Structure formats: structure tokens, C-alpha cells
Amino acid sequence: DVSFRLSGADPRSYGMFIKDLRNALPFREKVYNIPLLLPSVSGAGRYLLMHLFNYDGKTITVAVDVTNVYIMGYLADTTSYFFNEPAAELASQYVFRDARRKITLPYSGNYERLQIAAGKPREKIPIGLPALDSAISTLLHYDSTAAAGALLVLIQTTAEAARFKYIEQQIQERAYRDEVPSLATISLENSWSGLSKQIQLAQGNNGIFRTPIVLVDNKGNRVQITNVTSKVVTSNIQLLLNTR
Numbered sequence: 001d002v003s004f005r006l007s008g009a010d011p012r013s014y015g016m017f018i019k020d021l022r023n024a025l026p027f028r029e030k031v032y033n034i035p036l037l038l039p040s041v042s043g044a045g046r047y048l049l050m051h052l053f054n055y056d057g058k059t060i061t062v063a064v065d066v067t068n069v070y071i072m073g074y075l076a077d078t079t080s081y082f083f084n085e086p087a088a089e090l091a092s093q094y095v096f097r098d099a100r101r102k103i104t105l106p107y108s109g110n111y112e113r114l115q116i117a118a119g120k121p122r123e124k125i126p127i128g129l130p131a132l133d134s135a136i137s138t139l140l141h142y143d144s145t146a147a148a149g150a151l152l153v154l155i156q157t158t159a160e161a162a163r164f165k166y167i168e169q170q171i172q173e174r175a176y177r178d179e180v181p182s183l184a185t186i187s188l189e190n191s192w193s194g195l196s197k198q199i200q201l202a203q204g205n206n207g208i209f210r211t212p213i214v215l216v217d218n219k220g221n222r223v224q225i226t227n228v229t230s231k232v233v234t235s236n237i238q239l240l241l242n243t244r
């Protein structure tokens, strides 16, 4: 398992949590020095448990699919909660079985669906460590509207930070003051599957992307990613979604 305590959290302890989270995701090989997530894992081993604690020490446990860093659901006190999608019902077979009742949220984990349920897009929801404090508090007691926004914060401050060093650094900047994600943050979240695909394909194409990827850079400017010498590949992306 991995844990993160917001009580006494600083940029250093958040960075240690994101390091713990990346290290709990298995890999057999690296492609261009980036861990390649497994095509599949059978049984309960597919799901990593993250123990998150708000400033007041109240906690949820979050289930993460280790093949794709997708959050499936979470445990709050004696109630489990899962997204309304087949991958999450499958996860409910292995995690939080001991919960008194299992609620299926009235949405899938898709960003588009969560934003409709929350009533705001990601671009207008402040993220940071205070926002994660608020998200954990929201999730402790069922409220499906409130939970959709809390889940957008949770996804970005855990899974997306694991996937991209730049997003980890953006949340560190927001240790004590929330701020809507940067344009590069949204760009990277949107592009992880594409980048993962082009980096795997670049093996057999001399490190050249078969299809270049349009991103927004750290200064808010367009950058076209054509090959593995790009700083997005050499410094930023930390995990690859297996092309399978």
C-alpha cells in the first residue's frame, strides 16, 4: 500500500508520496528509460490501495488499477464507492469486500462525465494540497455532485502527478494555495495515452513519432513533439500505458 498525510504535508512529503505511488506500479521493462506498465495483472494484485488522510486525520482508501493508474473506487468508513463502468465493477470483486454496503456512483470515471456531474470543467476547478484535503473530506460522506469535483481533484493530485513530473511539481507549487491547473497540466493529462503510444512506436522508427503530438509547454506555448529527445520524453513522463 502507499499513504499520504495532509497534516504536516510539505512539498517534500508530497513528493515522497508520488515516488511511493510510482514505485508500487509493477514493470518488467523500461522503454527509453521510462517504466512500461504491465499489459494485465490477474486477481487482487491488479489494485494498489492508497491511504489518504485529511488535515484532521480522517481517511479514505483509494483503489488504483496498476496497469493504467485508473482510480476504480474508494472506501470511506464502512461504505465502498465504485465508478459506474465495467472495470470498476470488476475491481469491486477484489477490494473493500468487507464494507457494509457498496454504492455505485452515478457516473463513470471519464473526465468528460465527471465534469458534467461536477457542473464545471477541470480548467475551472482549483487543485493543490488544500483542495486534496477538501476532496478527502467531501468523499467521507456520500454526495454524488460534490464527489464528482472531489474525484477530479483526487485524480489530478495522485494519478496524473504519478504520470508526469511536471504535474507533480505543479501540485508542489500549490502546497498551501490552490490554483486551476496550468494549460500544460490539462494538455499532458489529455495526451498520456498518445505519448505512451508514440514512445513505444518510436522503438522501430529510430526514436521518431509515427504521429507527432501537439502539447502546451510550461510557458503556455504550443510545442509539437516529434521524437524521444523531447524533454517531455527525457524528463517529464514517468510511466507508459502499455500499447496492449
Ligand SMILES: O=c1[nH]c(=O)c2ncn([C@@H]3O[C@H](CO)[C@@H](O)[C@H]3O)c2[nH]1
Pocket: 069, 070, 071, 072, 085, 108, 109, 110, 111, 112, 155, 159, 160
Ligand atoms: O479514475 C480515473 N483515474 C485516472 O487516472 C484518469 N485519467 C483519466 N481518467 C479519465 O477516465 C476516463 C476513462 O473512463 C478517461 O477518458 C479519462 O477521461 C481517469 N479516471
